[PDB]
């Protein structure tokens, strides 16, 4: 249960990361490899966890 609590907090963190990324790309008008790949690797890490 404690491990799953940690997993949920990590998933909330990566969800906030993705929200920030989408908002920033919407403001800028284009997507960028650094942030896009960071979000992809966050998704991979959360999948592993």
């Amino acid at each position: 249960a404690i491990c799953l609590f940690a997993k949920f907090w990590h998933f909330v963190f990566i969800f906030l990361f993705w929200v920030f990324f989408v908002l920033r790309i919407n403001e800028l008008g284009r997507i960028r490899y650094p942030l896009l790949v960071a979000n992809v690797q966050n998704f991979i890490i959360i999948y592993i966890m």
Binding site: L23, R24, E27, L28, R30
Partner: protein, 67 residues
């Protein structure tokens, strides 16, 4: 080579395209200069100055600052 044929615009400035090949225009305005091709790019300089200045260090969005 396929030179630009004609520009049907009253603005004589736009007639610069007639002096260049179509391949040149594709290379320098469509493939790798797509975001820069035939654009003023003044916003690039404005954003550069905004980023490099020492303005208030309280940012809300990419467009506006915190109230």
């Amino acid at each position: 080579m396929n030179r630009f044929f004609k520009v049907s615009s009253k603005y004589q400035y736009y007639k610069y395209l007639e002096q260049y090949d179509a391949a040149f225009l594709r290379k320098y305005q469509s493939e790798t200069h797509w975001y820069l091709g035939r654009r003023g790019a003044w916003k690039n300089l404005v954003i550069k100055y905004a980023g490099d200045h020492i303005s208030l260090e309280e940012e809300h969005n990419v467009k506006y600052k915190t109230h």
